[PDB]
């Protein structure tokens, strides 16, 4: 019927209306929104958002560290079968190696075969950018005109091997010994300066090789841009879907099956894709929060008492800010729940607890590749789950404040309509 009876049954609603009528309670909630936004998009260790982004990226990097060494790759620049091409990528987690060797000849690159070199180059560039970033520390979510320098090398040897030909990079026909080219390259809509150089090395007592050096100067390190790289990593793997043959250590957890095609890891890859997607959705709330900042104070006008039915045109914004913070918080938690081994089973669980959330280096800093990186995650997946959790627990008051602010504002928007 009427309101008295309704508030006799739901007193927290009565308290909500009292607050919605009181400019200083509204202003307090608007302050709280300012502070919790800063916790989410300005802080690092304390932000559930930051940790979720970090987990999503770490899970992709770690997937590759676990299986990269076992992944076949080979052939020439045209994506076809090579007779005798050995193409080696540095600072990658190979079998007892800090490089990965792509020398599978005669077999035809493609699905359930060796990954083509073109595809490995895409995967490698992404892995180097992520690893450089993780080593340096991810910035806060609000900070998105940061940049980093990334530099990586690879080599080509064997007759017929076209994967370091100068024309691939725009270098003079020859060229290949000492030649260099500097060129822009677009990465996530930003302009990066890129220097690619070539040398020929003739070691005294064995085969000649070509070395290519890529220097990326000004790669963006924003959350949005790095999650695009993690997406490129895990999708390149899933789409090229190459053949793999793993090597188990006797004793300790074991990988099944021992061979097949990488896209066969369907849960692992789906989970990492979901995590990235959720992290991207979450990072997209950043703009909504900034646009609807709550730092201006509110009241009546002309020194007249505050009227919740006419003076609350700010409420739509206040509601959108708070809804957006709460969406961040929930996607963050969702990211963690996709990968957290407490709720996994079968072969997926044993992949995460047995491989992804372990590391065989030696805790060495993030982004470090060693001769023992292979067949382990070495991306701080366990610590990142733990820290996401700790941050969420320390977000208890703020989460309540955000819900109270969303409710105050919803109440005023209601009064406001009519």
């Amino acid at each position, epitope marked *: 019927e009427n309101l008295s009876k309704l508030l006799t049954r739901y007193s*927290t609603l009565n308290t909500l209306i009292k607050l919605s009528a009181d400019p200083s309670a509204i202003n307090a909630a608007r302050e709280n929104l300012g502070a919790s936004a800063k916790n989410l998009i300005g802080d690092t260790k304390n932000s559930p958002a930051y940790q979720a982004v970090l987990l999503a990226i770490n899970a992709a990097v770690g997937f590759w560290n676990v299986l990269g060494y076992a992944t076949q790759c080979g052939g020439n620049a045209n994506g076809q079968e090579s007779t005798s091409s050995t193409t080696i990528f540095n600072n990658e987690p190979g079998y007892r190696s800090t490089s990965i060797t792509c020398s599978l000849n005669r077999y035809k690159p493609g699905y359930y075969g060796p990954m083509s070199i073109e595809n490995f180059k895409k995967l490698n560039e992404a892995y180097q950018i992520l690893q450089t970033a993780l080593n340096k520390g991810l910035p806060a979510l609000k900070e998105n005109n940061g940049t980093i320098n990334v530099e990586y090398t690879y080599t080509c040897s064997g007759g017929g091997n076209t994967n370091c030909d100068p024309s691939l990079f725009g270098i003079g026909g020859d060229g290949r010994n000492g030649g260099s080219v500097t060129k822009t390259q677009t990465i996530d809509g930003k302009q990066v300066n890129t220097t690619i150089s070539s040398k020929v090395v003739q070691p005294p007592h064995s085969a000649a090789y070509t070395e290519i050096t890529n220097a990326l100067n000004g790669v963006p390190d924003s959350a949005q841009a790095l999650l695009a790289q993690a997406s490129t990593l895990i999708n390149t793997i899933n789409t090229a879907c190459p053949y793999f043959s793993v090597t188990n250590k006797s004793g300790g957890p074991q990988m099944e099956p021992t061979r097949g095609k990488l896209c066969g890891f369907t849960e692992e890859i789906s989970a990492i894709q979901k995590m990235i997607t959720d992290a991207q959705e979450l990072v997209n709330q950043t703009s909504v929060i900034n646009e609807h900042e709550q730092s201006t104070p509110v009241g009546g006008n002309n020194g007249k008492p505050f009227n919740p039915f006419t003076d609350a045109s700010f409420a739509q914004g206040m509601l959108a800010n708070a809804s957006a913070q709460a969406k961040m918080l929930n996607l963050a*938690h969702q990211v963690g729940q996709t990968i957290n081994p407490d709720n996994l089973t079968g072969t997926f669980k044993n992949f995460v607890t047995g491989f992804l959330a372990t590391c065989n280096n030696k805790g060495s800093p993030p982004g470090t590749v060693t001769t023992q990186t292979f067949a382990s995650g070495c991306a701080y997946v366990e610590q990142t789950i733990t820290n996401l959790n*700790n941050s969420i627990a320390h*977000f208890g008051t703020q989460e309540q404040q955000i819900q109270q602010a969303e409710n105050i504002a919803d109440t005023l928007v209601n009064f406001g309509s009519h």
Partner: nanobody
Amino acid sequence: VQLQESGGGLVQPGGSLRLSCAASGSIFSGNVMGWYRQAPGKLREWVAAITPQGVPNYADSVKGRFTISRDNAKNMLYLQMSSLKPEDTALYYCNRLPNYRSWGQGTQVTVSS
């Protein structure tokens, strides 16, 4: 997808109480859990929380008086309250963090002489 609190009651100031929360596995397993309360005239207030690995943290108003704990084998959350005051009178609720959006009935705690 369910939450249920018990162990509240009327006590004397100085008194003490142990609350329990039975949570479903989908809510509890792998999730930060926590306690909350709703005092007369006020909105729900966060009180404490604890990570799956059992690390607790508390609001300033209860730090050093209350202790939250969890038993991961029975999907149970506990809150142990000492040196209770009349300020601590409220309906107490449990949930994960972040919150599942349907709350339990709560358990009433009243403190008075």
